[PDB]
């Protein structure tokens with residue numbers, strides 16, 4: 001298991017524009033297009049992202065290309081974030097993937113907002129962090145996915161994804 005496979009399980013793969021859990025226009029493997037309610041605005045952002053007139057549909061290869069870019073960006077966002085970098089550096093390989101997953105889903109700002117959890121993770125207080133992570137809108141809104149990430153942080157294994 002790895003970050004790519006993990007996120008592919010969590011986000012799915014859709015080749016036509018769709019609405020995410022928050023009702024936002026998305027495509028491929030969890031690639032957010034826009035928060036705007038307009039499909040046209042979505043189609044426009046899509047074409048600009050792909051470099052062609054897509055008519056709201058992309059191929060598997062195009063989806064994967066967006067995905068590679070998105071993962072790279074998440075990582076890079078973590079490394080540039082003063083609150084995130086230190087935690088990431090302190091963690092083992094498996095838990096690093098859990099942190100990338102959160103950043104991919106909620107953005108650097110959102111993840112960085114988990115001040116208390118981050119500190120606990122940095123202290124390697126697994127059970128406490130898991131409890132704290134659960135007291136969030138994130139957990140209440142997408143509980144199954146949140147549980148998978150939380151277990152990953154808690155155990156340092158991929159058990160929740162097998």
Ligand SMILES: [Cl-]
Pocket residue numbers: 049
């Ligand atoms: Cl893009």
Ligand SMILES: [Cl-]
Pocket residue numbers: 141142143144145146
């Ligand atoms: Cl969920």
